[PDB]
Amino acid sequence: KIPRGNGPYSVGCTDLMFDHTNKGTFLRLYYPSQDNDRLDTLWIPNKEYFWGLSKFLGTHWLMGNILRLLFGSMTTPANWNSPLRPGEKYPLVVFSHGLGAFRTLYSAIGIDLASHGFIVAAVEHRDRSASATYYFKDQSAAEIGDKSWLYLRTLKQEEETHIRNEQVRQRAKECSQALSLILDIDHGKPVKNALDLKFDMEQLKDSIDREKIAVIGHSFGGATVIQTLSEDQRFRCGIALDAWMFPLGDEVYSRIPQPLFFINSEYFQYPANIIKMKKCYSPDKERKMITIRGSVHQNFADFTFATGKIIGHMLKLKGDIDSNVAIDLSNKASLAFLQKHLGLHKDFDQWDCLIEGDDENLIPGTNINTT
Protein backbone atom coordinates (compact mmCIF):
# COMPACT_ATOMS: atom_id res chain seq x y z
CA LYS A 1 0.00 0.00 0.00
CA ILE A 2 0.92 3.57 -0.88
CA PRO A 3 0.60 5.52 2.43
CA ARG A 4 -2.29 7.91 3.10
CA GLY A 5 -1.30 11.55 3.66
CA ASN A 6 -0.18 12.58 7.21
CA GLY A 7 -1.88 15.98 7.11
CA PRO A 8 -5.37 17.06 8.29
CA TYR A 9 -7.01 17.42 4.82
CA SER A 10 -8.69 14.61 2.85
CA VAL A 11 -7.21 14.20 -0.65
CA GLY A 12 -8.86 14.22 -4.10
CA CYS A 13 -7.32 13.28 -7.45
CA THR A 14 -8.20 13.97 -11.10
CA ASP A 15 -6.45 14.17 -14.51
CA LEU A 16 -6.30 17.22 -16.79
CA MET A 17 -5.19 17.36 -20.42
CA PHE A 18 -5.25 20.76 -22.22
CA ASP A 19 -4.97 21.16 -25.16
CA HIS A 20 -5.46 17.56 -26.54
CA THR A 21 -2.21 17.64 -28.67
CA ASN A 22 1.36 16.29 -28.04
CA LYS A 23 2.28 20.02 -27.24
CA GLY A 24 -0.57 20.48 -24.71
CA THR A 25 -0.36 20.01 -20.94
CA PHE A 26 -1.05 16.61 -19.34
CA LEU A 27 -1.07 16.48 -15.51
CA ARG A 28 -2.40 14.43 -12.58
CA LEU A 29 -3.86 16.83 -9.95
CA TYR A 30 -3.84 16.03 -6.16
CA TYR A 31 -5.81 18.48 -4.03
CA PRO A 32 -7.48 19.02 -0.61
CA SER A 33 -10.93 17.48 -1.01
CA GLN A 34 -14.39 18.31 0.44
CA ASP A 35 -15.36 14.60 0.64
CA ASN A 36 -13.80 11.32 1.70
CA ASP A 37 -16.25 8.69 0.34
CA ARG A 38 -15.20 8.47 -3.30
CA LEU A 39 -13.56 5.49 -5.02
CA ASP A 40 -9.77 5.33 -4.60
CA THR A 41 -7.63 6.39 -7.62
CA LEU A 42 -6.38 3.66 -10.03
CA TRP A 43 -2.51 3.82 -9.78
CA ILE A 44 -1.49 2.90 -13.36
CA PRO A 45 -4.65 3.56 -15.44
CA ASN A 46 -3.87 2.09 -18.93
CA LYS A 47 -2.33 -1.16 -20.26
CA GLU A 48 0.11 0.84 -22.49
CA TYR A 49 1.94 2.21 -19.37
CA PHE A 50 2.83 -1.47 -18.55
CA TRP A 51 4.07 -1.95 -22.18
CA GLY A 52 6.18 1.21 -21.71
CA LEU A 53 7.52 -0.04 -18.35
CA SER A 54 8.50 -3.38 -19.96
CA LYS A 55 10.39 -1.52 -22.79
CA PHE A 56 12.19 0.67 -20.18
CA LEU A 57 13.23 -2.46 -18.22
CA GLY A 58 14.67 -4.00 -21.44
CA THR A 59 12.26 -6.99 -21.41
CA HIS A 60 9.77 -8.43 -24.01
CA TRP A 61 6.54 -6.33 -24.03
CA LEU A 62 4.72 -9.55 -22.84
CA MET A 63 6.42 -8.95 -19.46
CA GLY A 64 4.18 -5.81 -19.76
CA ASN A 65 1.10 -8.12 -19.64
CA ILE A 66 2.60 -9.78 -16.50
CA LEU A 67 3.20 -6.34 -14.81
CA ARG A 68 -0.44 -5.49 -15.73
CA LEU A 69 -1.71 -8.76 -14.13
CA LEU A 70 0.25 -7.95 -10.88
CA PHE A 71 -0.36 -4.16 -10.67
CA GLY A 72 -3.30 -3.28 -13.02
CA SER A 73 -5.94 -3.12 -10.24
CA MET A 74 -3.72 -1.40 -7.60
CA THR A 75 -5.19 1.92 -6.30
CA THR A 76 -3.66 4.87 -4.45
CA PRO A 77 -5.58 6.48 -1.45
CA ALA A 78 -6.90 9.65 -3.13
CA ASN A 79 -10.64 10.28 -3.71
CA TRP A 80 -11.12 10.09 -7.50
CA ASN A 81 -12.85 13.28 -8.83
CA SER A 82 -13.82 14.39 -5.29
CA PRO A 83 -14.94 18.08 -5.11
CA LEU A 84 -12.20 20.56 -4.09
CA ARG A 85 -12.35 21.65 -0.43
CA PRO A 86 -13.80 25.25 -0.67
CA GLY A 87 -13.02 28.48 1.21
CA GLU A 88 -9.21 28.61 1.10
CA LYS A 89 -6.43 29.53 -1.35
CA TYR A 90 -3.84 26.75 -1.66
CA PRO A 91 -0.09 26.94 -2.53
CA LEU A 92 0.85 25.11 -5.76
CA VAL A 93 3.53 22.50 -6.43
CA VAL A 94 4.40 21.46 -9.97
CA PHE A 95 5.98 17.95 -9.83
CA SER A 96 8.40 16.41 -12.44
CA HIS A 97 8.83 12.60 -12.82
CA GLY A 98 12.04 10.63 -13.48
CA LEU A 99 13.26 8.73 -16.56
CA GLY A 100 11.00 5.74 -17.37
CA ALA A 101 8.29 7.12 -15.03
CA PHE A 102 5.03 9.04 -15.80
CA ARG A 103 2.54 11.33 -13.93
CA THR A 104 0.88 8.74 -11.58
CA LEU A 105 4.04 7.19 -9.97
CA TYR A 106 4.73 9.75 -7.21
CA SER A 107 1.32 9.70 -5.51
CA ALA A 108 2.92 8.98 -2.03
CA ILE A 109 4.47 12.55 -2.36
CA GLY A 110 1.47 14.22 -4.15
CA ILE A 111 -1.12 12.80 -1.64
CA ASP A 112 1.01 13.84 1.37
CA LEU A 113 1.48 17.40 0.08
CA ALA A 114 -2.29 17.65 -0.68
CA SER A 115 -3.20 16.36 2.82
CA HIS A 116 -1.23 19.40 4.21
CA GLY A 117 -3.20 21.93 2.04
CA PHE A 118 -1.25 21.97 -1.32
CA ILE A 119 -2.59 21.59 -4.82
CA VAL A 120 -0.09 19.33 -6.66
CA ALA A 121 0.23 19.25 -10.47
CA ALA A 122 2.20 16.11 -11.44
CA VAL A 123 3.08 16.72 -15.11
CA GLU A 124 3.40 13.94 -17.69
CA HIS A 125 6.36 14.78 -19.97
CA ARG A 126 6.11 14.41 -23.78
CA ASP A 127 9.92 14.51 -24.27
CA ARG A 128 10.06 10.64 -24.69
CA SER A 129 11.56 10.38 -21.13
CA ALA A 130 8.25 8.85 -19.90
CA SER A 131 7.91 5.02 -20.21
CA ALA A 132 4.67 5.86 -22.07
CA THR A 133 2.37 8.86 -22.52
CA TYR A 134 -0.59 9.69 -24.73
CA TYR A 135 -2.24 12.58 -26.56
CA PHE A 136 -4.78 12.99 -29.48
CA LYS A 137 -3.81 13.72 -33.12
CA ASP A 138 -6.68 16.20 -33.54
CA GLN A 139 -10.11 17.39 -32.32
CA SER A 140 -12.00 14.39 -33.85
CA ALA A 141 -9.62 11.84 -32.20
CA ALA A 142 -9.99 13.56 -28.76
CA GLU A 143 -13.87 13.46 -29.09
CA ILE A 144 -13.97 9.65 -29.70
CA GLY A 145 -11.09 8.94 -27.25
CA ASP A 146 -8.75 7.60 -29.96
CA LYS A 147 -5.37 7.79 -28.09
CA SER A 148 -1.94 8.06 -29.81
CA TRP A 149 0.76 6.58 -27.59
CA LEU A 150 4.33 7.86 -27.32
CA TYR A 151 6.95 5.46 -25.89
CA LEU A 152 10.36 5.95 -24.16
CA ARG A 153 13.27 6.77 -26.55
CA THR A 154 16.50 4.77 -26.15
CA LEU A 155 19.66 6.72 -26.91
CA LYS A 156 22.98 5.77 -28.52
CA GLN A 157 25.99 6.92 -26.34
CA GLU A 158 26.74 9.56 -29.05
CA GLU A 159 23.21 11.08 -28.50
CA GLU A 160 23.44 11.30 -24.65
CA THR A 161 24.74 14.83 -23.98
CA HIS A 162 22.66 16.59 -26.64
CA ILE A 163 19.31 14.72 -26.34
CA ARG A 164 19.22 14.71 -22.51
CA ASN A 165 19.78 18.49 -22.61
CA GLU A 166 17.01 18.96 -25.26
CA GLN A 167 14.71 16.87 -23.04
CA VAL A 168 15.40 18.78 -19.75
CA ARG A 169 14.62 22.06 -21.63
CA GLN A 170 11.31 20.66 -22.97
CA ARG A 171 10.56 19.41 -19.43
CA ALA A 172 11.11 22.96 -18.00
CA LYS A 173 8.86 24.43 -20.75
CA GLU A 174 6.23 21.77 -19.83
CA CYS A 175 6.48 22.80 -16.14
CA SER A 176 6.01 26.48 -17.05
CA GLN A 177 3.07 25.63 -19.37
CA ALA A 178 1.36 23.55 -16.61
CA LEU A 179 1.83 26.55 -14.24
CA SER A 180 0.23 28.97 -16.78
CA LEU A 181 -2.68 26.50 -17.38
CA ILE A 182 -3.47 26.28 -13.59
CA LEU A 183 -3.10 30.08 -13.14
CA ASP A 184 -5.56 30.69 -16.04
CA ILE A 185 -7.98 28.14 -14.56
CA ASP A 186 -7.61 30.03 -11.19
CA HIS A 187 -8.67 33.26 -13.00
CA GLY A 188 -11.74 31.48 -14.42
CA LYS A 189 -10.72 30.95 -18.08
CA PRO A 190 -13.01 28.19 -19.50
CA VAL A 191 -10.90 25.14 -20.31
CA LYS A 192 -12.41 22.03 -21.93
CA ASN A 193 -10.52 19.05 -20.42
CA ALA A 194 -9.63 16.71 -23.38
CA LEU A 195 -10.42 13.85 -20.97
CA ASP A 196 -14.11 13.43 -20.28
CA LEU A 197 -14.00 13.24 -16.45
CA LYS A 198 -16.61 14.18 -13.82
CA PHE A 199 -14.48 16.96 -12.23
CA ASP A 200 -15.59 20.51 -13.07
CA MET A 201 -12.43 22.67 -13.51
CA GLU A 202 -14.58 25.76 -12.55
CA GLN A 203 -14.06 24.65 -8.87
CA LEU A 204 -10.40 25.69 -9.18
CA LYS A 205 -11.41 29.36 -9.80
CA ASP A 206 -10.02 31.58 -6.95
CA SER A 207 -8.44 28.51 -5.29
CA ILE A 208 -4.67 29.12 -5.88
CA ASP A 209 -2.42 31.20 -3.59
CA ARG A 210 -0.87 32.78 -6.74
CA GLU A 211 2.46 33.89 -5.13
CA LYS A 212 3.06 30.51 -3.37
CA ILE A 213 4.46 28.35 -6.17
CA ALA A 214 7.17 25.67 -6.04
CA VAL A 215 8.64 23.08 -8.36
CA ILE A 216 9.60 19.57 -7.07
CA GLY A 217 10.93 16.53 -8.96
CA HIS A 218 12.83 13.23 -8.75
CA SER A 219 16.00 12.17 -10.67
CA PHE A 220 15.48 13.59 -14.26
CA GLY A 221 12.73 15.57 -12.49
CA GLY A 222 15.36 16.98 -10.08
CA ALA A 223 17.38 18.38 -13.06
CA THR A 224 13.95 19.70 -14.35
CA VAL A 225 13.51 21.60 -11.01
CA ILE A 226 16.81 23.45 -11.65
CA GLN A 227 16.30 24.15 -15.37
CA THR A 228 12.70 25.38 -14.53
CA LEU A 229 13.91 27.74 -11.73
CA SER A 230 16.58 29.33 -14.00
CA GLU A 231 13.97 30.00 -16.74
CA ASP A 232 10.71 30.89 -14.80
CA GLN A 233 10.80 33.31 -11.87
CA ARG A 234 7.13 32.56 -11.04
CA PHE A 235 8.56 29.47 -9.26
CA ARG A 236 9.70 30.78 -5.82
CA CYS A 237 11.76 27.75 -4.64
CA GLY A 238 12.59 24.20 -5.73
CA ILE A 239 13.20 20.77 -4.14
CA ALA A 240 15.33 18.31 -6.13
CA LEU A 241 14.79 14.72 -4.93
CA ASP A 242 17.94 12.68 -5.75
CA ALA A 243 18.59 14.88 -8.81
CA TRP A 244 20.31 13.37 -11.86
CA MET A 245 22.41 16.40 -12.92
CA PHE A 246 23.79 15.12 -16.31
CA PRO A 247 21.03 16.78 -18.53
CA LEU A 248 21.79 20.38 -17.36
CA GLY A 249 23.71 22.78 -19.61
CA ASP A 250 26.88 24.54 -18.30
CA GLU A 251 24.99 27.88 -18.37
CA VAL A 252 22.26 26.97 -15.78
CA TYR A 253 24.49 26.63 -12.66
CA SER A 254 25.10 30.33 -11.96
CA ARG A 255 21.47 31.26 -12.93
CA ILE A 256 19.29 29.95 -10.07
CA PRO A 257 18.39 32.89 -7.71
CA GLN A 258 15.62 30.89 -5.90
CA PRO A 259 16.19 28.78 -2.69
CA LEU A 260 16.95 25.16 -3.64
CA PHE A 261 16.87 22.02 -1.45
CA PHE A 262 18.62 18.77 -2.46
CA ILE A 263 17.22 15.61 -0.75
CA ASN A 264 19.42 12.64 -1.69
CA SER A 265 19.41 8.89 -1.24
CA GLU A 266 22.53 7.35 0.31
CA TYR A 267 23.21 4.73 -2.43
CA PHE A 268 22.44 6.56 -5.71
CA GLN A 269 24.85 9.52 -5.49
CA TYR A 270 28.41 9.70 -6.98
CA PRO A 271 31.13 12.43 -7.19
CA ALA A 272 30.37 13.70 -10.80
CA ASN A 273 26.73 14.26 -9.70
CA ILE A 274 27.66 15.87 -6.28
CA ILE A 275 30.20 18.21 -8.00
CA LYS A 276 27.36 19.42 -10.29
CA MET A 277 25.05 20.05 -7.24
CA LYS A 278 27.91 22.06 -5.56
CA LYS A 279 28.16 24.21 -8.76
CA CYS A 280 24.61 25.50 -7.86
CA TYR A 281 26.04 27.04 -4.63
CA SER A 282 27.00 30.75 -4.17
CA PRO A 283 27.20 32.79 -0.89
CA ASP A 284 24.21 34.95 -1.87
CA LYS A 285 22.03 31.86 -2.57
CA GLU A 286 19.97 29.72 -0.21
CA ARG A 287 21.02 26.02 -0.54
CA LYS A 288 20.36 22.98 1.63
CA MET A 289 21.29 19.31 1.20
CA ILE A 290 20.50 16.19 3.24
CA THR A 291 20.98 12.49 2.57
CA ILE A 292 18.52 9.81 3.82
CA ARG A 293 20.59 6.98 5.53
CA GLY A 294 20.06 3.46 4.09
CA SER A 295 18.00 4.76 1.10
CA VAL A 296 18.12 3.93 -2.64
CA HIS A 297 17.14 6.00 -5.75
CA GLN A 298 13.61 4.46 -5.96
CA ASN A 299 12.72 5.36 -2.29
CA PHE A 300 11.17 8.58 -3.71
CA ALA A 301 8.80 6.78 -6.14
CA ASP A 302 5.65 4.68 -5.45
CA PHE A 303 7.26 1.41 -6.62
CA THR A 304 8.97 1.39 -3.10
CA PHE A 305 5.46 0.53 -1.72
CA ALA A 306 4.40 -1.85 -4.54
CA THR A 307 6.20 -5.07 -3.38
CA GLY A 308 7.33 -6.93 -0.25
CA LYS A 309 10.68 -6.28 1.51
CA ILE A 310 12.74 -9.18 0.03
CA ILE A 311 11.68 -8.69 -3.61
CA GLY A 312 11.86 -4.91 -2.98
CA HIS A 313 15.51 -4.94 -1.81
CA MET A 314 16.43 -7.32 -4.72
CA LEU A 315 14.98 -5.02 -7.44
CA LYS A 316 16.49 -1.88 -5.72
CA LEU A 317 12.94 -0.60 -4.99
CA LYS A 318 13.70 -0.56 -1.24
CA GLY A 319 16.80 0.24 0.79
CA ASP A 320 17.93 -0.80 4.29
CA ILE A 321 15.62 1.90 5.74
CA ASP A 322 11.82 1.35 5.98
CA SER A 323 10.02 2.94 2.94
CA ASN A 324 7.40 4.76 5.08
CA VAL A 325 10.19 6.05 7.39
CA ALA A 326 12.24 7.40 4.37
CA ILE A 327 9.25 9.05 2.55
CA ASP A 328 8.09 10.69 5.87
CA LEU A 329 11.55 12.31 6.27
CA SER A 330 11.62 13.49 2.62
CA ASN A 331 7.96 14.83 2.85
CA LYS A 332 8.35 16.51 6.29
CA ALA A 333 11.69 18.19 5.46
CA SER A 334 10.05 19.33 2.14
CA LEU A 335 7.11 20.90 4.06
CA ALA A 336 9.40 22.80 6.46
CA PHE A 337 11.46 24.13 3.45
CA LEU A 338 8.26 25.16 1.55
CA GLN A 339 6.86 26.97 4.65
CA LYS A 340 10.17 28.92 4.98
CA HIS A 341 10.60 29.97 1.30
CA LEU A 342 6.90 30.36 0.34
CA GLY A 343 6.07 32.20 3.58
CA LEU A 344 3.32 29.79 4.72
CA HIS A 345 1.42 30.26 8.01
CA LYS A 346 1.18 26.57 8.89
CA ASP A 347 3.00 24.44 11.51
CA PHE A 348 5.60 22.94 9.10
CA ASP A 349 8.44 24.70 10.99
CA GLN A 350 8.10 21.77 13.52
CA TRP A 351 10.38 19.93 10.97
CA ASP A 352 13.02 22.74 10.55
CA CYS A 353 15.69 20.46 12.09
CA LEU A 354 15.24 17.91 9.23
CA ILE A 355 16.33 20.67 6.72
CA GLU A 356 19.68 20.56 8.65
CA GLY A 357 19.78 16.72 8.53
CA ASP A 358 19.33 16.58 12.34
CA ASP A 359 17.73 13.13 12.75
CA GLU A 360 19.23 9.64 13.33
CA ASN A 361 18.19 8.53 9.76
CA LEU A 362 19.60 11.75 8.16
CA ILE A 363 23.13 12.72 7.07
CA PRO A 364 23.68 16.54 6.94
CA GLY A 365 24.97 17.38 3.45
CA THR A 366 26.37 14.30 1.67
CA ASN A 367 28.19 11.06 2.46
CA ILE A 368 30.02 11.50 -0.94
CA ASN A 369 33.63 12.72 -0.85
CA THR A 370 34.61 14.95 -3.87
CA THR A 371 38.33 15.72 -4.77
Ligand X SMILES: O=C(c1cccc(F)c1)N1CC=CC1
**Which of 7, 224, 283, 220 has its CA nearest to residue 118?**
7
CA 243 to chain centre: 12
Catalytic residue from among 127, 242, 302, 328: 242
> Which residues 6+ apart lie within 8 Å of 193 measured at CB?
16, 17, 18, 199, 201
Nearest to ligand X of 21, 75 (CB atom) = 75
How far is residue 333's CA from residue 44's CA, in Å, rounded to a whole number?
28
Sign of the alpha-carbon torsion through 80, 86, 90, 94: positive
State yes or no: residue 107 binds ligand X (CB under 6 A): no
Nearest to ligand X of 32, 319 (CB atom) = 319
Pick from Cl ion, ligand X, Mg ion, none: which does 232 bind, CB < 5 to 8 A by kind? Mg ion
The window from 20-28, 51-59, 265-273, 345-353 that contacts ligand X (CB under 6 A) reads: 51-59
Q: Least distance from C-beta 83 to Mg ion, angstroms?
A: 33
Task: Verify cis geometry, omega within 30 degrees of 0, for the bond prior to 19.
Answer: yes
Nearest to Cl ion of 132, 274 (CB atom) = 274
How far is residue 231's CA from residue 335's CA, in Å, rounded to a whole number?
24
CA atoms within a 13 Å half-sphere pointing along the CA-CB vector of 191? 29
State yes or no: residue 246 binds Cl ion (CB under 5 A): no
To the nearest 10 degrees (0 to 180), the angle between helices 47-56 and 62-71 is 120
Q: How are beta strands 11-18 and 75-80 bridged, if at all? A: parallel
Q: Least distance from C-beta 57 to ligand X, angstroms?
A: 6
Applying the rule CB under 6 A, the residues between 287 and 306 that interact with ligand X are 298, 303
The vertex-324 CA angle with 332 and 53, nearest 5°, equals 105
Q: x/- contact string, 118-147, with ligand X (CB under 6 A)?
A: -------------x----------------
State yes or no: residue 101 binds ligand X (CB under 6 A): yes
The window from 10-18, 97-105, 341-349, 356-364 that contacts ligand X (CB under 6 A) reads: 97-105
Pick from Mg ion, ligand X, Cl ion, none: which does 270 bind, CB < 5 to 8 A by kind? Cl ion
Residue with smallest beta-carbon separation from ligand X: 100
Catalytic residue annotation:
219, 242, 297
Binding residues for Cl ion (CB under 5 A): 267-268, 270-272, 296-297
